[PDB]
């Protein structure tokens, strides 16, 4: 029911963000399912490398925007007032769908 | 190569008749990566030749390759101006390989309307020692014999 959706820039930041999201709801008492993988988006950027003469040389960069879905099964009174506000994850864009 | 000898990628038998030589035949005859269209024309030409000639499907390409199968090849020994054609006994892989390259090039050269007709005509004319591939085989043997400075 509480369809939490996380969006981060690093693989070792979002699994750790959803680790407390699973522990601070499972321990206090509720029904919780595990994290759904939700495929990572890879955005590529290819730009010319040399400033004034550049015919066939280019530099290639990319960003991997990771995603996660917790999807809390039952919205009990224990998890509603304890889940968020404690992770300090400033680099994770959380989104919640009911 | 320079560092070590390298043999070309080995193949498996064909899916229809189970022969490793027909697999090489359809692979050489293939154009643009379309193996299906290539084997379709090869099987069609083989079937029409086996029906028209009246011989078995095995001898329909075995005797045709046999008449274009060389027994000597040319070595570039540099005697005649940095290139020459000294004759030596052809190895079996090269023996069947040169035969397939010649009969395929002859099928490409033939002026018939359909590739199935160009192939069934070269396959027919080859076995009776009259085809274009037979002319190619019976020209290199003469040039090799004429340039037999060594053996």
């Amino acid at each position: 029911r509480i369809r939490i959706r996380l969006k981060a820039f690093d693989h070792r930041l979002i699994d750790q963000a959803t680790a407390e999201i699973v522990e601070t709801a499972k321990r206090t008492g509720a029904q919780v399912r595990g994290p759904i993988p939700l495929p990572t988006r890879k955005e590529r950027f290819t730009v010319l490398i040399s400033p004034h003469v550049n015919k066939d040389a280019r530099d290639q960069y990319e960003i991997r925007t990771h995603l996660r879905l917790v999807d809390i099964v039952e919205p009990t009174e224990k998890t509603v007032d304890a889940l968020m506000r404690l992770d300090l994850a400033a680099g994770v864009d959380v989104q919640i769908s009911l | 190569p320079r560092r070590r000898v390298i043999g070309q990628r080995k193949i498996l038998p064909d899916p229809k008749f189970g022969s490793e030589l027909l697999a090489k035949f359809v692979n050489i005859l293939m154009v643009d990566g379309k193996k299906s269209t290539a084997e379709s024309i090869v099987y069609s030409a083989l079937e029409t030749l086996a029906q028209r000639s009246g011989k078995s499907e095995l001898e329909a390409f075995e005797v045709a390759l046999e008449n274009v199968r060389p027994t000597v090849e040319v070595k570039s020994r540099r005697v005649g101006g940095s290139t020459y054609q000294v004759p030596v006994e052809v190895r079996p892989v090269r023996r069947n390989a040169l035969a397939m390259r010649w009969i395929v090039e002859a099928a490409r050269k033939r002026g018939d309307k359909s590739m199935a007709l160009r192939l069934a005509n070269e396959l027919s004319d080859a076995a009776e020692n009259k085809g274009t591939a037979v002319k190619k085989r019976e020209d290199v043997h003469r040039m090799a014999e004429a340039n037999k400075a060594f053996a």
Binding site: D56, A57, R58, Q60 | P15, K35, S36, E39
Partner: protein, 127 residues
């Protein structure tokens, strides 16, 4: 109960579920000869099973997606070899000699900057 094997060929993905029964093969809720068994890749799926002679022993329910005719049949080929553990391992030891137990490492090489494709280089001037 069930004997499972995944299998992949460069773009494709299959689930080969081997259940006891008749010798027919169900692929994508359709028969084998109908989909592509009368055209290209007709007997490549039969090469692992030809060695053990399982003609009417096991039915295969297969769901495959991705790639093309050859890619789907290759995913079915590697799925059957992975799913060949149904009985004792004395039969896959001879299937290894055939070369189908080995997963093919033949996969496409990426395009590179300055090149039209994987290795093709642009034409150089004569002078």
């Amino acid at each position: 109960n069930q004997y499972y094997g995944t299998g992949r060929r460069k773009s494709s993905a299959a689930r080969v579920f081997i259940k006891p029964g008749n010798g027919k093969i169900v692929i994508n809720q359709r028969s084998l000869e109908q989909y592509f068994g009368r055209e290209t890749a007709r007997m490549v799926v039969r090469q692992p099973l030809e060695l053990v002679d399982m003609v009417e022993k096991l039915d295969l329910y297969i769901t495959v997606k991705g790639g093309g005719i050859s890619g789907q049949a290759g995913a079915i080929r590697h799925g059957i070899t992975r799913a060949l553990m149904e009985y004792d391992e004395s039969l896959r030891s001879e299937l290894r000699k055939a070369g189908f137990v080995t997963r093919d490492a033949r996969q496409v090489e990426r395009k590179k900057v300055g090149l039209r494709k994987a290795r093709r280089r642009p034409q150089f001037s004569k002078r």
